[PDB]
């Protein structure tokens, strides 16, 4: 237990080597997975702290164990800051993940077998929004809604579904949707059938905090989110709720579905929220939206199609059919050229779910490492180059060579 | 980008918590001090990676190096406990338990677990926990001798026919007869799940009976006596590998915390060393000596002895409640927690006992002599909890101990 002797290299050479290779992989690859980001050294330092040694069951000033004076300060700062970030009436910063945040809401307000509404997985919804192989879909009755012919959210069909099936709770938000979501319209739909509105803003949370994407907080009963992704924090979850749901939400997280919170991660959440309150963060998110638009614009110029026809956020879904390539094949080829994306089903995808006709692209990560409009356009063209000739070794080589020039010029961690 | 520069408030709070861990003798049985190497791992850049799925079977590309990490964690924890399969992704012990429930049960099914009043955990069927709110819970407890009442448990099993039986505890000092519990479960066609969270480190070192050969599922925290990062693990027989893995993902979790899994692997590496078995031998020794010392001073140990890291102290002969004992001891910089004893005459928030554990103090270097001194220091406070002179004298001696035995050097 000497900090000079107990280093990863000294204790575990294998793990040391793996972490080192992952550090270099993060430098040497252009990351375009929309859910990924690079969190600050300050954030990482916090969850590498001795706060992992503390059991702090309960809430600030209301713990089961003693000695929680300082972790109470930590958690309350996290609570106050995330409340300030989104203008929420109350908050819970203990969810271990985005999944647990969502489950926390379900446990608080629902009973197994209740009917819920959520965006279909096939049209950009998340697993925890009602997938039959997820708890949300196996232990509850799920009625899903999707997009219309214009590839915008079909609010009319959702309203008809709400009146027909009378859900106890409506889930909104997405893992792969490029446009602004009309939270006010959804709140009216939910109120019209006496349902709760839960918005999962995990992907947009950073953009919302900077005010470059609509805030669901004034409209929703509950707002759940991850602290990683566009919020650029540590890996974990947060529940935002109206004051009237403070008691059941806090009780649901503990002792409902969790035990001792990860106080070291909560500290990291607090550091991330502090960063998110700065003017620099708003400037970062403005560049996130700009880079995403430029990336989508460039792909359209090269003959690709964007689902919904445009992006109004950090993310886009690219229809690949014009280049006669599957999402799976595109993901692999792009990967060989050191560009990380992920395959993703498009609306009415003619391919199998594990094959798909599209790729999901996001700008938060590349924006964090300093990419601007010019680089975003270059990346778009590099992507198209691979898509038009995915198995040509010479093409992959040329692109990988240019990617190397970008990553050397824009290092992630200095 | 340091915490001090970026977030002065959080930095100061962390520094204060560092000092608090040094300046207090920690006897909360679930607490420990994990190594700098472990902390460094979950402070790594692996927090930047989404790795939904399992090694070699991810949704996303670029998982080559986190795959090496997770598989090292899986292989090492399999080796530590002789398990046929393992899942190292649970975010906590609670999620580890929920993973098993989601895999094998449907809402409304009947389960058996140790009662909370007799040392069981929240996730073993508490009505305000998921385990107890969405399932029908039949609890079993201790007999008159304050050992597990296996006869009553077998009768309850035959009567209520649970689909699953949970064993393990948060506050039980004796060796649990896992083989007996397995026979019971098999007789009624029930699964046996053992939650070994408190004993996992002792079990890895072979100083406490291993439930793995006898149970269908063994869940645990990676913190506590195993001395790793905060998180959970499921160990399971090979025939249940698929439903368990599927239940963790995409069942109840999403992206695993790869930085914490790396920290788990480092902790498992440490637990495989000869130094760890020697550590756990000292853990058992110090707990026994602590219990022995308290008995000489007139206190009583629930179950009459300890065979592990933990003990539940009956405080009634000293005419002090667990609540008062915890408060007075805390003032003297000795951290314990109140705990109800079997047939406790006091209200649940008052109790007639305190739970004590040796893992934390053993980790910072306490031996048999220090364990005995701590026992006497505790008894001094218990016998005069409101005496200012007694609290100060004990605090001064505690200060002498924490200075000679620093947690982090
Ligand atoms: C919208 C949304 N909500 C929750 C999650 C998962 O949270 P986790 O911390 O992984 O339990 C996600 C995750 N999706 C990953 C991705 O889109 O790549 C999500 O999108
Ligand atoms: C036996 C047992 N099982 C699960 C847990 C909690 O896991 P967590 O990571 O907190 O969700 C515990 C926890 N107990 C606290 C204590 O005993 O002090 C446990 O003992």
mmCIF file with all atom_site columns, N, CA and C and ligand atoms in Angstrom, chain A residues 33-36 96-103 124-129 172-176 200-204 224-229 235-237 342 344 360, chain B residues 50 52 60 91 249 252-257, ligand 1:
data_model
loop_
_atom_site.group_PDB
_atom_site.id
_atom_site.type_symbol
_atom_site.label_atom_id
_atom_site.label_alt_id
_atom_site.label_comp_id
_atom_site.label_asym_id
_atom_site.label_entity_id
_atom_site.label_seq_id
_atom_site.pdbx_PDB_ins_code
_atom_site.Cartn_x
_atom_site.Cartn_y
_atom_site.Cartn_z
_atom_site.occupancy
_atom_site.B_iso_or_equiv
_atom_site.pdbx_formal_charge
_atom_site.auth_seq_id
_atom_site.auth_comp_id
_atom_site.auth_asym_id
_atom_site.auth_atom_id
_atom_site.pdbx_PDB_model_num
ATOM   1   N N   . UNK A 1 33  ? -18.290 7.181  -32.870 1.00 0.00 ? 33  UNK A N   1
ATOM   2   C CA  . UNK A 1 33  ? -19.428 6.588  -32.183 1.00 0.00 ? 33  UNK A CA  1
ATOM   3   C C   . UNK A 1 33  ? -20.082 7.668  -31.322 1.00 0.00 ? 33  UNK A C   1
ATOM   4   N N   . UNK A 1 34  ? -21.363 7.919  -31.575 1.00 0.00 ? 34  UNK A N   1
ATOM   5   C CA  . UNK A 1 34  ? -22.051 9.103  -31.057 1.00 0.00 ? 34  UNK A CA  1
ATOM   6   C C   . UNK A 1 34  ? -22.200 9.106  -29.541 1.00 0.00 ? 34  UNK A C   1
ATOM   7   N N   . UNK A 1 35  ? -22.017 7.942  -28.928 1.00 0.00 ? 35  UNK A N   1
ATOM   8   C CA  . UNK A 1 35  ? -22.180 7.792  -27.488 1.00 0.00 ? 35  UNK A CA  1
ATOM   9   C C   . UNK A 1 35  ? -20.854 7.902  -26.745 1.00 0.00 ? 35  UNK A C   1
ATOM   10  N N   . UNK A 1 36  ? -19.769 8.057  -27.497 1.00 0.00 ? 36  UNK A N   1
ATOM   11  C CA  . UNK A 1 36  ? -18.436 8.102  -26.917 1.00 0.00 ? 36  UNK A CA  1
ATOM   12  C C   . UNK A 1 36  ? -17.934 9.533  -26.774 1.00 0.00 ? 36  UNK A C   1
ATOM   13  N N   . UNK A 1 96  ? -25.940 3.923  -10.921 1.00 0.00 ? 96  UNK A N   1
ATOM   14  C CA  . UNK A 1 96  ? -24.673 3.343  -11.367 1.00 0.00 ? 96  UNK A CA  1
ATOM   15  C C   . UNK A 1 96  ? -24.480 3.434  -12.873 1.00 0.00 ? 96  UNK A C   1
ATOM   16  N N   . UNK A 1 97  ? -25.576 3.640  -13.586 1.00 0.00 ? 97  UNK A N   1
ATOM   17  C CA  . UNK A 1 97  ? -25.554 3.705  -15.041 1.00 0.00 ? 97  UNK A CA  1
ATOM   18  C C   . UNK A 1 97  ? -26.812 4.380  -15.553 1.00 0.00 ? 97  UNK A C   1
ATOM   19  N N   . UNK A 1 98  ? -26.883 4.582  -16.864 1.00 0.00 ? 98  UNK A N   1
ATOM   20  C CA  . UNK A 1 98  ? -28.096 5.081  -17.491 1.00 0.00 ? 98  UNK A CA  1
ATOM   21  C C   . UNK A 1 98  ? -29.224 4.071  -17.356 1.00 0.00 ? 98  UNK A C   1
ATOM   22  N N   . UNK A 1 99  ? -28.880 2.787  -17.444 1.00 0.00 ? 99  UNK A N   1
ATOM   23  C CA  . UNK A 1 99  ? -29.860 1.713  -17.301 1.00 0.00 ? 99  UNK A CA  1
ATOM   24  C C   . UNK A 1 99  ? -30.493 1.706  -15.917 1.00 0.00 ? 99  UNK A C   1
ATOM   25  N N   . UNK A 1 100 ? -29.669 1.844  -14.879 1.00 0.00 ? 100 UNK A N   1
ATOM   26  C CA  . UNK A 1 100 ? -30.163 1.895  -13.504 1.00 0.00 ? 100 UNK A CA  1
ATOM   27  C C   . UNK A 1 100 ? -30.958 3.166  -13.233 1.00 0.00 ? 100 UNK A C   1
ATOM   28  N N   . UNK A 1 101 ? -30.600 4.251  -13.914 1.00 0.00 ? 101 UNK A N   1
ATOM   29  C CA  . UNK A 1 101 ? -31.359 5.483  -13.778 1.00 0.00 ? 101 UNK A CA  1
ATOM   30  C C   . UNK A 1 101 ? -32.778 5.236  -14.265 1.00 0.00 ? 101 UNK A C   1
ATOM   31  N N   . UNK A 1 102 ? -32.896 4.613  -15.436 1.00 0.00 ? 102 UNK A N   1
ATOM   32  C CA  . UNK A 1 102 ? -34.202 4.307  -16.014 1.00 0.00 ? 102 UNK A CA  1
ATOM   33  C C   . UNK A 1 102 ? -34.976 3.297  -15.180 1.00 0.00 ? 102 UNK A C   1
ATOM   34  N N   . UNK A 1 103 ? -34.275 2.277  -14.694 1.00 0.00 ? 103 UNK A N   1
ATOM   35  C CA  . UNK A 1 103 ? -34.896 1.267  -13.847 1.00 0.00 ? 103 UNK A CA  1
ATOM   36  C C   . UNK A 1 103 ? -35.359 1.874  -12.542 1.00 0.00 ? 103 UNK A C   1
ATOM   37  N N   . UNK A 1 124 ? -34.721 3.865  -33.481 1.00 0.00 ? 124 UNK A N   1
ATOM   38  C CA  . UNK A 1 124 ? -33.748 4.681  -32.779 1.00 0.00 ? 124 UNK A CA  1
ATOM   39  C C   . UNK A 1 124 ? -33.860 4.681  -31.265 1.00 0.00 ? 124 UNK A C   1
ATOM   40  N N   . UNK A 1 125 ? -34.853 3.971  -30.736 1.00 0.00 ? 125 UNK A N   1
ATOM   41  C CA  . UNK A 1 125 ? -35.040 3.873  -29.300 1.00 0.00 ? 125 UNK A CA  1
ATOM   42  C C   . UNK A 1 125 ? -33.952 3.049  -28.639 1.00 0.00 ? 125 UNK A C   1
ATOM   43  N N   . UNK A 1 126 ? -33.892 3.108  -27.313 1.00 0.00 ? 126 UNK A N   1
ATOM   44  C CA  . UNK A 1 126 ? -32.879 2.368  -26.583 1.00 0.00 ? 126 UNK A CA  1
ATOM   45  C C   . UNK A 1 126 ? -33.450 1.085  -25.981 1.00 0.00 ? 126 UNK A C   1
ATOM   46  N N   . UNK A 1 127 ? -32.559 0.146  -25.669 1.00 0.00 ? 127 UNK A N   1
ATOM   47  C CA  . UNK A 1 127 ? -32.919 -1.126 -25.049 1.00 0.00 ? 127 UNK A CA  1
ATOM   48  C C   . UNK A 1 127 ? -33.823 -0.960 -23.833 1.00 0.00 ? 127 UNK A C   1
ATOM   49  N N   . UNK A 1 128 ? -33.528 0.041  -23.009 1.00 0.00 ? 128 UNK A N   1
ATOM   50  C CA  . UNK A 1 128 ? -34.260 0.255  -21.762 1.00 0.00 ? 128 UNK A CA  1
ATOM   51  C C   . UNK A 1 128 ? -35.582 0.979  -21.986 1.00 0.00 ? 128 UNK A C   1
ATOM   52  N N   . UNK A 1 129 ? -35.948 1.173  -23.250 1.00 0.00 ? 129 UNK A N   1
ATOM   53  C CA  . UNK A 1 129 ? -37.194 1.850  -23.584 1.00 0.00 ? 129 UNK A CA  1
ATOM   54  C C   . UNK A 1 129 ? -38.239 0.839  -24.025 1.00 0.00 ? 129 UNK A C   1
ATOM   55  N N   . UNK A 1 172 ? -39.623 8.883  -23.665 1.00 0.00 ? 172 UNK A N   1
ATOM   56  C CA  . UNK A 1 172 ? -39.151 9.627  -24.824 1.00 0.00 ? 172 UNK A CA  1
ATOM   57  C C   . UNK A 1 172 ? -37.635 9.735  -24.804 1.00 0.00 ? 172 UNK A C   1
ATOM   58  N N   . UNK A 1 173 ? -37.057 10.032 -25.961 1.00 0.00 ? 173 UNK A N   1
ATOM   59  C CA  . UNK A 1 173 ? -35.613 10.069 -26.091 1.00 0.00 ? 173 UNK A CA  1
ATOM   60  C C   . UNK A 1 173 ? -35.161 8.967  -27.022 1.00 0.00 ? 173 UNK A C   1
ATOM   61  N N   . UNK A 1 174 ? -33.902 9.018  -27.437 1.00 0.00 ? 174 UNK A N   1
ATOM   62  C CA  . UNK A 1 174 ? -33.414 8.053  -28.408 1.00 0.00 ? 174 UNK A CA  1
ATOM   63  C C   . UNK A 1 174 ? -31.906 7.881  -28.341 1.00 0.00 ? 174 UNK A C   1
ATOM   64  N N   . UNK A 1 175 ? -31.438 6.784  -28.932 1.00 0.00 ? 175 UNK A N   1
ATOM   65  C CA  . UNK A 1 175 ? -30.013 6.506  -29.050 1.00 0.00 ? 175 UNK A CA  1
ATOM   66  C C   . UNK A 1 175 ? -29.525 6.870  -30.445 1.00 0.00 ? 175 UNK A C   1
ATOM   67  N N   . UNK A 1 176 ? -30.460 6.958  -31.387 1.00 0.00 ? 176 UNK A N   1
ATOM   68  C CA  . UNK A 1 176 ? -30.123 7.263  -32.775 1.00 0.00 ? 176 UNK A CA  1
ATOM   69  C C   . UNK A 1 176 ? -31.220 8.082  -33.450 1.00 0.00 ? 176 UNK A C   1
ATOM   70  N N   . UNK A 1 200 ? -35.533 10.293 -21.636 1.00 0.00 ? 200 UNK A N   1
ATOM   71  C CA  . UNK A 1 200 ? -34.161 9.820  -21.544 1.00 0.00 ? 200 UNK A CA  1
ATOM   72  C C   . UNK A 1 200 ? -33.290 10.673 -22.459 1.00 0.00 ? 200 UNK A C   1
ATOM   73  N N   . UNK A 1 201 ? -32.592 11.645 -21.884 1.00 0.00 ? 201 UNK A N   1
ATOM   74  C CA  . UNK A 1 201 ? -31.826 12.598 -22.680 1.00 0.00 ? 201 UNK A CA  1
ATOM   75  C C   . UNK A 1 201 ? -30.345 12.253 -22.760 1.00 0.00 ? 201 UNK A C   1
ATOM   76  N N   . UNK A 1 202 ? -30.005 10.996 -22.473 1.00 0.00 ? 202 UNK A N   1
ATOM   77  C CA  . UNK A 1 202 ? -28.614 10.555 -22.360 1.00 0.00 ? 202 UNK A CA  1
ATOM   78  C C   . UNK A 1 202 ? -27.707 11.090 -23.470 1.00 0.00 ? 202 UNK A C   1
ATOM   79  N N   . UNK A 1 203 ? -28.143 10.943 -24.715 1.00 0.00 ? 203 UNK A N   1
ATOM   80  C CA  . UNK A 1 203 ? -27.336 11.377 -25.846 1.00 0.00 ? 203 UNK A CA  1
ATOM   81  C C   . UNK A 1 203 ? -27.216 12.893 -25.982 1.00 0.00 ? 203 UNK A C   1
ATOM   82  N N   . UNK A 1 204 ? -28.256 13.622 -25.586 1.00 0.00 ? 204 UNK A N   1
ATOM   83  C CA  . UNK A 1 204 ? -28.317 15.064 -25.836 1.00 0.00 ? 204 UNK A CA  1
ATOM   84  C C   . UNK A 1 204 ? -27.957 15.937 -24.626 1.00 0.00 ? 204 UNK A C   1
ATOM   85  N N   . UNK A 1 224 ? -34.096 11.256 -17.215 1.00 0.00 ? 224 UNK A N   1
ATOM   86  C CA  . UNK A 1 224 ? -32.938 10.426 -16.922 1.00 0.00 ? 224 UNK A CA  1
ATOM   87  C C   . UNK A 1 224 ? -31.819 10.715 -17.903 1.00 0.00 ? 224 UNK A C   1
ATOM   88  N N   . UNK A 1 225 ? -30.592 10.412 -17.497 1.00 0.00 ? 225 UNK A N   1
ATOM   89  C CA  . UNK A 1 225 ? -29.453 10.639 -18.361 1.00 0.00 ? 225 UNK A CA  1
ATOM   90  C C   . UNK A 1 225 ? -28.218 9.871  -17.906 1.00 0.00 ? 225 UNK A C   1
ATOM   91  N N   . UNK A 1 226 ? -27.303 9.656  -18.845 1.00 0.00 ? 226 UNK A N   1
ATOM   92  C CA  . UNK A 1 226 ? -25.952 9.218  -18.533 1.00 0.00 ? 226 UNK A CA  1
ATOM   93  C C   . UNK A 1 226 ? -25.096 10.441 -18.254 1.00 0.00 ? 226 UNK A C   1
ATOM   94  N N   . UNK A 1 227 ? -23.995 10.261 -17.537 1.00 0.00 ? 227 UNK A N   1
ATOM   95  C CA  . UNK A 1 227 ? -23.087 11.376 -17.292 1.00 0.00 ? 227 UNK A CA  1
ATOM   96  C C   . UNK A 1 227 ? -21.937 11.373 -18.297 1.00 0.00 ? 227 UNK A C   1
ATOM   97  N N   . UNK A 1 228 ? -21.713 10.231 -18.937 1.00 0.00 ? 228 UNK A N   1
ATOM   98  C CA  . UNK A 1 228 ? -20.781 10.174 -20.053 1.00 0.00 ? 228 UNK A CA  1
ATOM   99  C C   . UNK A 1 228 ? -21.519 10.632 -21.315 1.00 0.00 ? 228 UNK A C   1
ATOM   100 N N   . UNK A 1 229 ? -21.004 10.276 -22.487 1.00 0.00 ? 229 UNK A N   1
ATOM   101 C CA  . UNK A 1 229 ? -21.511 10.783 -23.777 1.00 0.00 ? 229 UNK A CA  1
ATOM   102 C C   . UNK A 1 229 ? -21.304 12.305 -23.900 1.00 0.00 ? 229 UNK A C   1
ATOM   103 N N   . UNK A 1 235 ? -18.647 7.540  -16.371 1.00 0.00 ? 235 UNK A N   1
ATOM   104 C CA  . UNK A 1 235 ? -19.695 6.593  -16.701 1.00 0.00 ? 235 UNK A CA  1
ATOM   105 C C   . UNK A 1 235 ? -20.641 6.396  -15.513 1.00 0.00 ? 235 UNK A C   1
ATOM   106 N N   . UNK A 1 236 ? -21.903 6.754  -15.707 1.00 0.00 ? 236 UNK A N   1
ATOM   107 C CA  . UNK A 1 236 ? -22.901 6.608  -14.666 1.00 0.00 ? 236 UNK A CA  1
ATOM   108 C C   . UNK A 1 236 ? -24.202 7.244  -15.101 1.00 0.00 ? 236 UNK A C   1
ATOM   109 N N   . UNK A 1 237 ? -25.158 7.319  -14.180 1.00 0.00 ? 237 UNK A N   1
ATOM   110 C CA  . UNK A 1 237 ? -26.461 7.878  -14.487 1.00 0.00 ? 237 UNK A CA  1
ATOM   111 C C   . UNK A 1 237 ? -26.937 8.925  -13.493 1.00 0.00 ? 237 UNK A C   1
ATOM   112 N N   . UNK A 1 342 ? -20.433 2.811  -35.859 1.00 0.00 ? 342 UNK A N   1
ATOM   113 C CA  . UNK A 1 342 ? -21.138 1.547  -35.670 1.00 0.00 ? 342 UNK A CA  1
ATOM   114 C C   . UNK A 1 342 ? -22.312 1.393  -36.624 1.00 0.00 ? 342 UNK A C   1
ATOM   115 N N   . UNK A 1 344 ? -25.987 0.464  -37.939 1.00 0.00 ? 344 UNK A N   1
ATOM   116 C CA  . UNK A 1 344 ? -27.257 0.829  -37.337 1.00 0.00 ? 344 UNK A CA  1
ATOM   117 C C   . UNK A 1 344 ? -28.382 0.670  -38.342 1.00 0.00 ? 344 UNK A C   1
ATOM   118 N N   . UNK A 1 360 ? -24.179 4.819  -37.773 1.00 0.00 ? 360 UNK A N   1
ATOM   119 C CA  . UNK A 1 360 ? -24.455 5.959  -36.911 1.00 0.00 ? 360 UNK A CA  1
ATOM   120 C C   . UNK A 1 360 ? -23.161 6.728  -36.675 1.00 0.00 ? 360 UNK A C   1
ATOM   121 N N   . UNK B 2 50  ? -17.237 2.378  -24.763 1.00 0.00 ? 50  UNK B N   1
ATOM   122 C CA  . UNK B 2 50  ? -18.472 1.598  -24.753 1.00 0.00 ? 50  UNK B CA  1
ATOM   123 C C   . UNK B 2 50  ? -18.173 0.191  -25.250 1.00 0.00 ? 50  UNK B C   1
ATOM   124 N N   . UNK B 2 52  ? -20.515 -2.729 -24.948 1.00 0.00 ? 52  UNK B N   1
ATOM   125 C CA  . UNK B 2 52  ? -21.698 -3.575 -24.821 1.00 0.00 ? 52  UNK B CA  1
ATOM   126 C C   . UNK B 2 52  ? -21.418 -4.974 -25.365 1.00 0.00 ? 52  UNK B C   1
ATOM   127 N N   . UNK B 2 60  ? -19.793 -3.199 -30.643 1.00 0.00 ? 60  UNK B N   1
ATOM   128 C CA  . UNK B 2 60  ? -18.918 -2.204 -31.266 1.00 0.00 ? 60  UNK B CA  1
ATOM   129 C C   . UNK B 2 60  ? -17.553 -2.779 -31.620 1.00 0.00 ? 60  UNK B C   1
ATOM   130 N N   . UNK B 2 91  ? -22.466 -3.862 -11.985 1.00 0.00 ? 91  UNK B N   1
ATOM   131 C CA  . UNK B 2 91  ? -22.061 -2.562 -11.462 1.00 0.00 ? 91  UNK B CA  1
ATOM   132 C C   . UNK B 2 91  ? -21.950 -2.536 -9.945  1.00 0.00 ? 91  UNK B C   1
ATOM   133 N N   . UNK B 2 249 ? -26.468 -8.439 -19.615 1.00 0.00 ? 249 UNK B N   1
ATOM   134 C CA  . UNK B 2 249 ? -26.655 -7.662 -20.838 1.00 0.00 ? 249 UNK B CA  1
ATOM   135 C C   . UNK B 2 249 ? -27.228 -8.527 -21.961 1.00 0.00 ? 249 UNK B C   1
ATOM   136 N N   . UNK B 2 252 ? -30.282 -6.159 -17.751 1.00 0.00 ? 252 UNK B N   1
ATOM   137 C CA  . UNK B 2 252 ? -30.422 -5.114 -16.737 1.00 0.00 ? 252 UNK B CA  1
ATOM   138 C C   . UNK B 2 252 ? -29.306 -4.067 -16.759 1.00 0.00 ? 252 UNK B C   1
ATOM   139 N N   . UNK B 2 253 ? -28.307 -4.253 -17.613 1.00 0.00 ? 253 UNK B N   1
ATOM   140 C CA  . UNK B 2 253 ? -27.253 -3.252 -17.745 1.00 0.00 ? 253 UNK B CA  1
ATOM   141 C C   . UNK B 2 253 ? -27.021 -2.920 -19.212 1.00 0.00 ? 253 UNK B C   1
ATOM   142 N N   . UNK B 2 254 ? -26.203 -1.900 -19.452 1.00 0.00 ? 254 UNK B N   1
ATOM   143 C CA  . UNK B 2 254 ? -25.801 -1.531 -20.797 1.00 0.00 ? 254 UNK B CA  1
ATOM   144 C C   . UNK B 2 254 ? -24.298 -1.673 -20.916 1.00 0.00 ? 254 UNK B C   1
ATOM   145 N N   . UNK B 2 255 ? -23.617 -0.574 -21.231 1.00 0.00 ? 255 UNK B N   1
ATOM   146 C CA  . UNK B 2 255 ? -22.167 -0.584 -21.299 1.00 0.00 ? 255 UNK B CA  1
ATOM   147 C C   . UNK B 2 255 ? -21.534 -0.869 -19.947 1.00 0.00 ? 255 UNK B C   1
ATOM   148 N N   . UNK B 2 256 ? -20.668 -1.891 -19.884 1.00 0.00 ? 256 UNK B N   1
ATOM   149 C CA  . UNK B 2 256 ? -19.979 -2.161 -18.617 1.00 0.00 ? 256 UNK B CA  1
ATOM   150 C C   . UNK B 2 256 ? -18.946 -1.080 -18.311 1.00 0.00 ? 256 UNK B C   1
ATOM   151 N N   . UNK B 2 257 ? -18.600 -0.919 -17.039 1.00 0.00 ? 257 UNK B N   1
ATOM   152 C CA  . UNK B 2 257 ? -17.560 0.019  -16.633 1.00 0.00 ? 257 UNK B CA  1
ATOM   153 C C   . UNK B 2 257 ? -16.195 -0.637 -16.802 1.00 0.00 ? 257 UNK B C   1
HETATM 154 C C1  . LIG C 3 .   ? -30.614 6.968  -24.640 1.00 0.00 ? 1   LIG C C1  1
HETATM 155 C C2  . LIG C 3 .   ? -29.780 6.020  -23.829 1.00 0.00 ? 1   LIG C C2  1
HETATM 156 N N1  . LIG C 3 .   ? -30.108 5.761  -22.509 1.00 0.00 ? 1   LIG C N1  1
HETATM 157 C C3  . LIG C 3 .   ? -29.345 4.892  -21.753 1.00 0.00 ? 1   LIG C C3  1
HETATM 158 C C4  . LIG C 3 .   ? -28.240 4.283  -22.331 1.00 0.00 ? 1   LIG C C4  1
HETATM 159 C C5  . LIG C 3 .   ? -27.363 3.299  -21.602 1.00 0.00 ? 1   LIG C C5  1
HETATM 160 O O1  . LIG C 3 .   ? -26.848 3.733  -20.374 1.00 0.00 ? 1   LIG C O1  1
HETATM 161 P P1  . LIG C 3 .   ? -25.727 2.765  -19.733 1.00 0.00 ? 1   LIG C P1  1
HETATM 162 O O2  . LIG C 3 .   ? -24.786 3.601  -18.901 1.00 0.00 ? 1   LIG C O2  1
HETATM 163 O O3  . LIG C 3 .   ? -24.968 2.094  -20.853 1.00 0.00 ? 1   LIG C O3  1
HETATM 164 O O4  . LIG C 3 .   ? -26.413 1.706  -18.897 1.00 0.00 ? 1   LIG C O4  1
HETATM 165 C C6  . LIG C 3 .   ? -27.920 4.529  -23.652 1.00 0.00 ? 1   LIG C C6  1
HETATM 166 C C7  . LIG C 3 .   ? -26.745 3.821  -24.250 1.00 0.00 ? 1   LIG C C7  1
HETATM 167 N N2  . LIG C 3 .   ? -26.498 3.582  -25.528 1.00 0.00 ? 1   LIG C N2  1
HETATM 168 C C8  . LIG C 3 .   ? -25.177 3.308  -26.060 1.00 0.00 ? 1   LIG C C8  1
HETATM 169 C C9  . LIG C 3 .   ? -25.048 3.864  -27.462 1.00 0.00 ? 1   LIG C C9  1
HETATM 170 O O5  . LIG C 3 .   ? -25.968 4.526  -27.953 1.00 0.00 ? 1   LIG C O5  1
HETATM 171 O O6  . LIG C 3 .   ? -24.038 3.657  -28.135 1.00 0.00 ? 1   LIG C O6  1
HETATM 172 C C10 . LIG C 3 .   ? -28.681 5.403  -24.409 1.00 0.00 ? 1   LIG C C10 1
HETATM 173 O O7  . LIG C 3 .   ? -28.338 5.639  -25.715 1.00 0.00 ? 1   LIG C O7  1
#
